[PDB]
RNA sequence: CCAUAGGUUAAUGAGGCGAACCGGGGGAACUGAAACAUCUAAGUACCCCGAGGAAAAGAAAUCAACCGAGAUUCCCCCAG
RNA sequence: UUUUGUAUAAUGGGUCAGCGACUUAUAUUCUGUAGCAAGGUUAACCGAAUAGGGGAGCCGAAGGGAAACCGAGUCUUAACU
RNA sequence: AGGACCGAACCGACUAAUGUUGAAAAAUUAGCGGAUGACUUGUGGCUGGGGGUGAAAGGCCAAUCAAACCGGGAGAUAGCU
RNA sequence: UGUAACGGGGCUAAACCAUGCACCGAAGCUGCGGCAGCGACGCUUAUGCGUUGUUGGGUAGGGGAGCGUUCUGUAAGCCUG
RNA sequence: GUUUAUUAAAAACACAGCACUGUGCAAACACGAAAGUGGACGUAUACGGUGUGACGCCUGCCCGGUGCCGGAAGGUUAAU
RNA sequence: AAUUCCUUGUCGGGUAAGUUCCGACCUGCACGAAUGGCGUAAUGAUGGCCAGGCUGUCUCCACCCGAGACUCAGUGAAAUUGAACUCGCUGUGAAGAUGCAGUGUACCCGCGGCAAGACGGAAAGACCCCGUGAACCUUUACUAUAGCUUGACACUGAACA
RNA sequence: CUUUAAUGUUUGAUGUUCUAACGUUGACCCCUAAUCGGGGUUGCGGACAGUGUCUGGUGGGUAGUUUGACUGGGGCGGUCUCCUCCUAAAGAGUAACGGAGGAGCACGAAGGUUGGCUAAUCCUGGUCGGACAUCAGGAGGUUAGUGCAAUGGCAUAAGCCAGCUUGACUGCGAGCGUGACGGCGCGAGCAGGUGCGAAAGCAGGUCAUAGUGAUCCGGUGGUUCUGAAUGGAAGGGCCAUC
């Protein structure tokens, strides 16, 4: 049977162009009052998955 | 600790505000300061 | 009996 | 078979270490914004073409080549970027 | 996904975004596809005539991308910037 | 009291068995979740009732999207 | 066989013969190979039936953006050196 | 008269020896307790598994019992050998 | 448990120190024969030979290349009283 | 007297006796989706549950805690 | 003390000598009044201790009678078993050697005996730990839930205060 | 409007009485040669009781489960994240139930900037006044100070005082450090708007290194980005934040 994609995943990542995925940086939800702006600032922008972390993503996304 | 968080929201028709701590025991006087709103891009009163 | 016991 | 009763130690902690200490060494070529040195205080000092960060961190403002040097009448100890 | 029972990648960062339904139902068409039409007109039923968007598709858009050398009316497809400079230098006439 | 219940007789039918499939009435747990309770396994196993050569469903108080389709069932897509 | 390490006094086997453990299906990715190639390929089904028909679809030739949207660019930002 | 006494049958099972691939998956031999009773025994009946029954030992429920047996879920699961 | 603190015999050097030259001694190195991997270089691409250099201990494990077994076609063929 | 059939027969269990407590009879209580049945063809001098354990002499202080019984003004508080 | 750790407490009795027993003391680690206290005639295949009698229990064994054991004839198992041409010692060594080193001893093969070793046989250690194992049991662990209990509405009406 | 009557009306509670639902494991009759059942009749009870649905309490009676790891065996004890020093072998890093201490904040000034200033301790003299207050001079030279541990720093002070202030700015960010990763850190410069300074300049918090918590779920404000026929809306997204 068809494999079926972990919905999690799916909804945390996207494939670019040349096969990458895109995900939103972690610590930008809450106790935001302490975090200075610069560091709020670059998380803010959405970012590569690293390469130890490629395997791990492609496996949970066959159909990305 | 003791120290509340409190919004110091623009003077402008704006929704902006900064975010920032006050020992309310202590300073129980109203913070304001002329900040920078983004949305009307001038500084101007912030309050709170 | 047992063997090492306890 | 008696076993005697351990007691505890008090100590057991340390923290993080933080990789401080010389990232370019003398003559090494550097692009501006370049790291040379993260430290605690300014055991080293800025000089030419060299900023000093909020932690003390000396960072390249030229690309250059590194250069330490001791300089000045307490003989500090100053890194620079000779601009090459 | 399994990293040992660490909080594995997938939920250790946030979701984001929500899916339109619009752009399921809207296309891109290439400047190679308004030759292969057939009749010269290229409106959304004509494209759909000849497979080259999906029959559930509602908008579609004329993208510079290939080649038209051949006249060719558009009728009622958004087009860029580009492709209507190629379909105007081609003889084409673009109609909203 | 009338009557009704009740009683007797006759006629007609049923009863029981049987593989799977089918409709219905009830309905687990191991297991998976690297523990576990929501969740899963699964309306599965199993029990029960009923039927037929098939059953069930079925002739829009249905979809659609301002264009249209035109009962039910089954197959391939749509789409992990 | 298991181990840092076994002649080990650690495990298993009395012997022989026969049997006894990485499979199958469907998805997906990569490699090889073959076909065709900006195209490739059809499913169910129809069919004197491994042909032929069937292109419904699917993948590919465009991306960026949460999205509207724009598009060889796009997003970000009032605007980018 | 008697949950009276001594003591066979009958019902038990305190001690020792033997036996321990037994004559026997609980016995034999020598002693031992009860022996008109809350006794013992034949035949038949009833109670069914989180259930029974228990002068209570988690005892017993077909040589099985801190949840019988048989079939099924079932190739449970086994980061272990 | 038995000499039992040179491995034994035995040794007054067959001990120890110094100097020296011989010799023994390994699957090390060399010689002779053979096989294979990889690279270079030219024959010349069916990728073969040729030359040259070098390498070839191996568990987990990765890569490469084969043997044999039963069954289908080739096979109403071929072998076989 | 009883008991671990098959390593424990005892100081364990039971026991007459004692006490607390429930129970007014369609009893309490128990088995049972229920009907019903046992309790009992009994009726508080009876029946159930609990602890103690012939008999003799006896059984002291504590109601703060946890239960149980009684109260119900007030506070709090469900569906509606 | 069926309770006392210290403890063989101390004192007395009994014995030549008594960590046990009996009497007593009270310093009750940690008795105590119906999860009864203290006592108690009788009773017990009940626990502890002392006597008389009695004895192969023993000093310390001896002899005898039977059944096996032994030999012959007939029948004919079993556990175990990597393979064995299966010695001692001192060393060595996965650390306790028939098997390694060194050395000593030793002609080949039965039968009756004995059990020191073959870490002998037997049962994939019950102890112990581990497994995000199991069961059953407990409770003021968590979450549920039968039961019991509360009220609303329904079955459910009338009249008057 | 604050108090307060009367009437009407809508309700709720309470108490009586009734009978006709309902109950009867009271009597009698019949089905009937029947201690079941049903029907009839008559007493008693009576809108109670009881049952259904909903609902609060109680509920080891029963069920499903959980009850951490490290550990010189396990338990008991101790520990678990973060900062500083040493161990650490002169780059980085580096273990033990190794040796020692700290954190889970504070501060609208204790932040920015301009201007100015310079410590401890001792000695000598001096009213109350001493070993130690404040004053004066000398010696001394940071032996002080740093909001809080330790280390490294600090006089051009980063230490102390004052004026004016909000850069404790918003968007970004060449380039680097440090991490398996999530991530964390340092950063000139660019745009906008600001503060201090005559000006060069400095300022995107604090001498630096602790003062912390992913995701999910949800809350608040903003933004038409989305909006399941269409217009809206709900809900979702995005930005800020809890
Ligand atoms: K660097
Ligand atoms: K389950
Ligand atoms: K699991
Ligand atoms: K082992
Ligand atoms: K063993
Ligand atoms: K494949
Ligand atoms: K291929
Ligand atoms: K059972
Ligand atoms: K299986
Ligand atoms: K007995
Ligand atoms: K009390
Ligand atoms: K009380
Ligand atoms: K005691
Ligand atoms: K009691
Ligand atoms: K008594
Ligand atoms: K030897
Ligand atoms: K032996
Ligand atoms: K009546
Ligand atoms: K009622
Ligand atoms: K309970
Ligand atoms: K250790
Ligand atoms: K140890
Ligand atoms: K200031
Ligand atoms: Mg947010
Ligand atoms: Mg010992
Ligand atoms: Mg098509
Ligand atoms: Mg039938
Ligand atoms: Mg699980
Ligand atoms: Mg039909
Ligand atoms: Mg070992
Ligand atoms: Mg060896
Ligand atoms: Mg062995
Ligand atoms: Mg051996
Ligand atoms: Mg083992
Ligand atoms: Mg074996
Ligand atoms: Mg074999
Ligand atoms: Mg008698
Ligand atoms: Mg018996
Ligand atoms: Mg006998
Ligand atoms: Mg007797
Ligand atoms: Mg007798
Ligand atoms: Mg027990
Ligand atoms: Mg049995
Ligand atoms: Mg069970
Ligand atoms: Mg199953
Ligand atoms: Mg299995
Ligand atoms: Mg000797
Ligand atoms: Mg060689
Ligand atoms: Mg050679
Ligand atoms: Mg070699
Ligand atoms: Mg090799
Ligand atoms: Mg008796
Ligand atoms: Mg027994
Ligand atoms: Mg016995
Ligand atoms: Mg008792
Ligand atoms: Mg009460
Ligand atoms: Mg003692
Ligand atoms: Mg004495
Ligand atoms: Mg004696
Ligand atoms: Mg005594
Ligand atoms: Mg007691
Ligand atoms: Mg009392
Ligand atoms: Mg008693
Ligand atoms: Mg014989
Ligand atoms: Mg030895
Ligand atoms: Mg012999
Ligand atoms: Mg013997
Ligand atoms: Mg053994
Ligand atoms: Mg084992
Ligand atoms: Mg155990
Ligand atoms: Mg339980
Ligand atoms: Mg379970
Ligand atoms: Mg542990
Ligand atoms: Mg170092
Ligand atoms: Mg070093
Ligand atoms: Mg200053
Ligand atoms: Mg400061
Ligand atoms: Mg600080
Ligand atoms: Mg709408
Ligand atoms: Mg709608």
Known sequence: ?64 | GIREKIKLVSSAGTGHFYTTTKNKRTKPEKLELKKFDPVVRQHVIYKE | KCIRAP | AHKKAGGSTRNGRDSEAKRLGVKRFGGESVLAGSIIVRQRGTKFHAGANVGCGRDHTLFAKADGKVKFEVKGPKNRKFISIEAE | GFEGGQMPLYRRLPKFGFTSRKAAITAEIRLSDLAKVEGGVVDLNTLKAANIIGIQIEFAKVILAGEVTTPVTVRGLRVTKGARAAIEAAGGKIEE
């Open chain 1, 1 to 64: 049977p068809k494999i079926k994609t972990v919905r999690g995943a799916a909804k945390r990542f996207k494939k670019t162009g040349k096969g990458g995925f895109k995900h939103k940086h972690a610590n930008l939800r809450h106790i935001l009052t302490k975090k200075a702006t610069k560091r709020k600032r670059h998380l803010r922008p959405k970012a590569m998955v690293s390469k130890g972390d490629l395997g791990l993503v492609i496996a949970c996304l066959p159909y990305a």
